[PDB]
């Protein structure tokens, strides 16, 4: 998991979702692309 | 002449009964405090007590708005260094339902001996039954 203030898509398989008030990035191809805003 | 003043030895008081099911906490507390102080009688006098007795039923069924059922916090301190303690609205309703209405009403009454005496006329129950049939209370719809 990467925790930071600027979160964005890094490839074409990345997706942006909002869960319980937080902005997250989840990817189905690369586990290194998993991000959380905080 | 001189302005009229009430006398504690000759005031008249009455008994009422209220139901708290589905009501909003603060908007019920305002009415309770108003009638306990006695601001609805034309004989109101700031240094005398001229209120009524009120019974409240079904205290565990009072309502709140928004996300307050999990987000309102009650605090207190014990007197020992480090002794700060807290609870939530759900926890309070689970263990001591009557304190919820009691604290709200006590916050809206005057601070001092007369306010403490005004607080003594409130009777709060968590269920649907009371044992004051000898005083013959009348129904009050708020």
């Amino acid at each position: 998991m990467k925790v930071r203030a600027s979160v964005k898509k890094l490839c074409r398989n990345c997706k942006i979702v909002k869960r319980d008030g937080v902005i997250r990035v989840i990817c189905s191809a690369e586990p290194k692309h998993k991000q959380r805003q905080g | 002449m001189k302005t009229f003043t009430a006398k504690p030895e000759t005031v008249k008081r009455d008994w009422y009964v209220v139901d708290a099911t589905g009501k909003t906490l603060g908007r019920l507390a305002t009415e309770l405090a108003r009638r306990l102080r006695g601001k609805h009688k034309a004989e109101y006098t700031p240094h005398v007590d001229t209120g009524d007795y009120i019974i409240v039923l079904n205290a565990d069924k009072v309502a709140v708005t928004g996300n307050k059922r999990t987000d309102k916090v009650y605090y207190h301190h014990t007197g020992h260094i480090g002794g700060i303690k807290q609870a939530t609205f759900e926890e309070m309703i689970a263990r001591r339902p009557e304190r919820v209405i009691e604290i709200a009403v006590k916050g809206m009454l005057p601070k001092g001996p007369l306010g403490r005496a005004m607080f003594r006329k409130l009777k709060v129950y968590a269920g649907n039954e009371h044992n004051h049939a000898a005083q013959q209370p009348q129904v009050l719809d708020i």
């Binding site: - | 002449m1 302005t3 009229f4 609805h40 034309a42 004989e43 109101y44 700031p46």
Partner: protein, 59 residues
Amino acid sequence: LWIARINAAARQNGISYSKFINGLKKASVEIDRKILADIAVFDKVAFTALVEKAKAALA
């Protein structure tokens, strides 16, 4: 003190203090708050009559 007692008496007849004062001003009554409170405590039929006067003026 006078104002508080007048509010209590008016709301038992079905009106608020502010509307009551407005109605008396429009009906051209010049009784002051001291006397109004005295009547509110010691004579209720007269106070009801005054409230009716104010309501008719406001209508």
